[PDB]
Amino acid sequence: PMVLLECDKDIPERQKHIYLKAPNEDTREFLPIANAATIPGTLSERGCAFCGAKLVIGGVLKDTIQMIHGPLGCAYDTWHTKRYPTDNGHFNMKYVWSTDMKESHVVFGGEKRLEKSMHEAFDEMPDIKRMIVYTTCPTALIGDDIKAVAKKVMKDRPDVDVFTVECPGFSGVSQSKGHHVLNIGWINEKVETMEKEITSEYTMNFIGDFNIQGDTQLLQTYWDRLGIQVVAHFTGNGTYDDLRCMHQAQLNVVNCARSSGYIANELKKRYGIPRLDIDSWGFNYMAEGIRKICAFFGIEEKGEELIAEEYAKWKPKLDWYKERLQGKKMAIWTGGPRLWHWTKSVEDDLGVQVVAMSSKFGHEEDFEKVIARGKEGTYYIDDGNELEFFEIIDLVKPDVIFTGPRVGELVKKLHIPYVNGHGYHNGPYMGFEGFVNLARDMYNAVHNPLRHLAAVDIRDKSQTTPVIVRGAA
C-alpha cells in the first residue's frame, strides 16, 4: 500500500510518494508520484537543473571549457566533487570556469561579461577550442541571451565551437530538467555538424554512461575485443567533436535511460538508429547485454568467447562474495536508475535483499522499472527526505546502504556501513570485473571490525571486546 510515515503526519501528501509492495497488489494502482514539486523545508536530497546539465553530463567531456554564466558559487560547487577520469590527465576535474557575475551585471546585463570571460578562457588555454556555456539562476532571471553571445564569439573566433544550455536551478524540480534541456539542444544543434572515419563494419554509440571511476574505459575493452567501433560515448571519457558525429552509428546502446534516453529517442526518430536498453551493472546483466549487441551485429561467437573468458576470470570471486553476502539487507538511496539496475542484479548475483530504495529525481518511468524488478516488503520512495530515511532504517534495518558520502557519514552514527552509490568506493562498478569490485566493497563495509567495536560500551563490566574473523576472495 501507500505509506504515511510518522515523520510525515504534517506533510501527508508524502504518502503518495511512498509505496510498500505487498502480496497480490496490482502495482498499477500504487505507482508513486514522481518528478513533482519538492516540499520546502523537508531536507529533500534534490539538487538543481544546472547540476544535471553541467556536473552530470556536459562536465564529463575531456576537452571542453565549462563556462558557468553566473556568480562564482555555482562554479565552486561543481568542482572537486565528481570522479570521472579521462585519458588526457583529467582536464575535466582540474578546472571550472565562471563569469564571476557582480551586482553591476545584474543591473546592466551580463552578456559582455560572458563574452569577455569566453575569450579569456580560450586565450588562457590555446589548445582548447570547445566550450559549453550554462546559465544559472540569476543570468536566467536577467535574460542574458547566451546563445547570441556564443554566436558572436564563434563568428569572431572561427576555430572554436560553442554550445549553450539554459538551466537555471529553479527550472523544473530537480536535476532532471537539466538532462532534458542539454540532450535536446545537442541533437538539435550539434549532431551531424561533422563526421569521422568509420573503421569497422559494426558501429554504435554508448548512451548514458559517465565514466564513473573508469566504467566507460572498462566497457571499451569489450568493444575493442569484439571489433565494434564506438562513434561516440555520451559522455564518459568523451570529446565534444565525437558527440557531433552521433548520427553515423548503426546502433545506440543505452544504460542511463533517465538522463540520456531523450537523445537516443531523437536519434531513432531523426536518423533511424535503433535504441537498445541494457544493464551495464550486474554480472549476468552484462552477459545479456553483450549477447544482444552481438546478435544485432551478427558476431555471436565473438560475444560467447568474451563471455566465457570473463566468467572464467571473475565468476569464482563473485560466487565467493555471494556465499558471504547472501541474505544481507541493502538500501539504495541514489538518483533513480541505479535502483532498477541494482535491485535484481544484487539479488541474482550476490543474494542480497534490497529492502528500501529512494530516488531523488526519478520519473514515474523509473518507478515502473524498479517496482517491476523489486521485492515484496520493500519500500519505494520518491524524493525521500532525511527524517524519512531514519524511519525507514528503523522499519527495515539494513546491513548496508548505497548512498552519497554525507548520508553515509550520518548513518555511520547508527553503526550502519555505506558504499558510495554515486561515485563508488573502489570502482569501476560496471561490467563483469566491476560487479566483483562492488561486491568486494559491500563485503568489506559490512564485515568490518570497527562496527563490532563501536557497539561495545567499555563501562559495562558484562561486556567484552570481540574479535572478528574476515576473509578475502
Binding site: 546502433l251 531523450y262 529517442n265 537498445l276 549477447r291 544482444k292 549487441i293 544485432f296 514515474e364 522499472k369
Partner: protein, 113 residues
C-alpha cells in the same frame, strides 16, 4: 495450464525486460509487438526477420527472452506452435494493459521527447 503458462511469461518479462518500459506509448506499443513477434518465431523454429536495423534489434531482444523461456519453463518445449502463438497474443494484450492502458505514468503521451 494455458493461464499458468501466460502468467509464467508475464512474470518473466516484468522482472527481466526493459523494452516494454520505453519513454512513450507509441514506443512501448512498437516494442511489445516487434519483440514478441520475433519471440514467437524463435520458439516455433521459424526464420527470424533480420533485414532492417529495427528488425535486427527486435531479434536481439527476442533471442534473450526465447532462450530464457526455453531454459526456465519446460512447458515451452512441449506446447505446439498454435499454443505458443495464442500465449504470445495474450502476453501482448497483458503488457499493453499494464504498461499503457492502466499505467499512471503521466509522460507516456507527451508528443515531444
Amino acid at each position: 495450464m494455458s493461464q499458468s503458462h501466460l502468467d509464467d511469461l508475464f512474470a518473466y518479462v516484468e522482472e527481466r525486460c526493459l523494452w516494454q518500459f520505453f519513454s512513450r506509448t507509441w514506443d512501448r506499443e512498437e516494442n511489445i509487438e516487434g519483440v514478441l513477434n520475433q519471440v514467437g518465431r524463435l520458439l516455433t523454429g521459424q526464420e527470424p526477420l533480420r533485414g532492417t536495423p529495427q528488425e535486427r534489434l527486435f531479434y536481439a531482444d527476442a533471442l534473450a527472452m526465447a532462450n530464457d523461456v526455453r531454459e526456465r519453463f519446460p512447458w515451452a518445449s512441449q506446447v505446439n506452435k498454435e499454443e505458443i502463438e495464442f500465449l504470445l497474443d495474450g502476453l501482448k494484450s497483458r503488457l499493453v494493459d499494464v504498461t499503457i492502458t492502466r499505467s499512471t505514468n503521466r509522460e507516456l503521451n507527451h508528443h515531444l521527447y
